[PDB]
Design a protein around this ligand. Structure first.
Ligand SMILES: [Zn+2]
Ligand SMILES: [Zn+2]
Length: 81
């Protein structure tokens, strides 16, 4: 099994780079968490659902967790740490 693929993306023209796939946004730029991401890349880490137009919450791990999940993971009873 061979694995190799370069990423032709060095130059930049008044465009933001997706903080998910590391690609230059040209079609549409979705502002989230201060940074810029693709309107399709932005998704949950657990359920992996599109959060393009819905509330969410992140953590130290930087793993955007949809309110629901976050409420089912973090809010799963008495926890501390
Ligand atoms: Zn992307
Ligand atoms: Zn989720």
């Amino acid at each position: 099994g061979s694995s190799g693929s370069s990423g032709e993306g060095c130059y930049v023209a008044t465009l933001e780079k997706c903080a998910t796939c590391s690609q230059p946004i040209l079609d549409r730029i979705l502002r989230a968490m201060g940074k810029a991401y693709h309107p399709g890349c932005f998704t949950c880490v657990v359920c992996h659902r599109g959060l393009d137009g819905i509330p969410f919450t992140v953590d130290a791990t930087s793993q955007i967790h949809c309110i629901e999940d976050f409420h089912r993971k973090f809010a799963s009873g008495p926890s501390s740490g």
